[PDB]
Amino acid sequence: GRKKIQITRIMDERNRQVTFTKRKFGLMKKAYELSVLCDCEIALIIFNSSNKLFQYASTDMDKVLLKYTEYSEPHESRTNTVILETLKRR
Amino acid sequence: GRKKIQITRIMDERNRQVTFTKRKFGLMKKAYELSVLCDCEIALIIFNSSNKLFQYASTDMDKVLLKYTEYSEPHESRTNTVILETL
DNA sequence: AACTATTTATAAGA
DNA sequence: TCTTATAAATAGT
C-alpha cells in the first residue's frame, strides 16, 4: 500500500469494492501457496456484503467440508471479536 | 523472503512445518482484514497433511457453511490443478 | 523464537 | 485499470 490503512470497514462504497476484489485474489493466492508448500487441504468461502459467494478449495470443496463436519477433536479456531476502543487525540 | 522460493511442496519436514505455522497465521490475518475492511463473511478450513484441523470464521462457522450449502447460483470457484512442467 | 534483507502485496494518485 | 511508492509478509539464519 502507498499508505498504511486502519483495519475497519471501508466507508466509501467503490473503494470497498476495489479493495475487496484485489485482496480476495491475494488471499486465494496465499491459500493456494499454503496448500502447495505445506501439503495441506484448504477451503475458503467468502460472502461479500451483498451475499454473493466466492470460493477456493485445494482438493474439492465438499470433500473438505465433509471432513470438517465429522472432525470431533478440540482444535485451533480463531474468529473476530469486537472490542470497545478509545481513539487518538487528534 | 530472504530468497525467492518456488511454489511446490517443501520437502524438508521441519521446514514444511515452520512454513505452515507462519503462513497459516498470515493467511488467517489477511482473512480477518478482508472481512473487516470489506464487510464480508469468511470461513477458512485448513487440514494439515496429518489431518489436524485449524479454522477461521469471521461470524460463526456453521452459519457461514449453512449459507454456502443453500447458495444456488453460479459463482467464482477456484481449486488447485496439477500441470506438467519443464525445467 | 527473534530479527533482517529480500520479496510479495497493496493503497493512493493518477 | 494502471503505477508506484510504501507497508506488510515471509524465508533464511
Swiss-Prot record, chain A:
Provide the MADS-box domain boundaries. 2-56
Q: Which domain of life is it from?
A: Eukaryota
Q: Which residues carry this modification: Phosphoserine?
A: 58
Q: In which tissues is it expressed?
A: Isoform MEF2 and isoform MEFA are expressed only in skeletal and cardiac muscle and in the brain. Isoform RSRFC4 and isoform RSRFC9 are expressed in all tissues examined.
The cellular location(s) given in this protein's UniProt record come to: Nucleus
The PTM entry states: Phosphorylated on these sites by MAPK14/p38alpha and MAPK11/p38beta, but not by MAPK13/p38delta nor by MAPK12/p38gamma. Has no effect on nuclear location nor on DNA binding. Sumoylated with SUMO1 and, to a lesser extent with SUMO2 and SUMO3. PIASx facilitates sumoylation in postsynaptic dendrites in the cerebellar cortex and promotes their morphogenesis.
Q: What does this protein do?
A: Transcriptional activator which binds specifically to the MEF2 element, 5'-YTA[AT](4)TAR-3', found in numerous muscle-specific genes. Also involved in the activation of numerous growth factor- and stress-induced genes. Mediates cellular functions not only in skeletal and cardiac muscle development, but also in neuronal differentiation and survival. Plays diverse roles in the control of cell growth, survival and apoptosis via p38 MAPK signaling in muscle-specific and/or growth factor-related transcription.
Self-association and partners: Binds DNA as a homo- or heterodimer. Dimerizes with MEF2D. Interacts with HDAC7. Interacts with PIAS1; the interaction enhances sumoylation. Interacts with HDAC4, HDAC9 and SLC2A4RG. Interacts (via the N-terminal) with MAPK7; the interaction results in the phosphorylation and transcriptional activity of MEF2A.
Family note:
Belongs to the MEF2 family.
What disease is linked with this protein in Swiss-Prot or TrEMBL? Coronary artery disease, autosomal dominant, 1: A common heart disease characterized by reduced or absent blood flow in one or more of the arteries that encircle and supply the heart. Its most important complication is acute myocardial infarction.
What is the protein name stated in its UniProt record? Answer: Myocyte-specific enhancer factor 2A
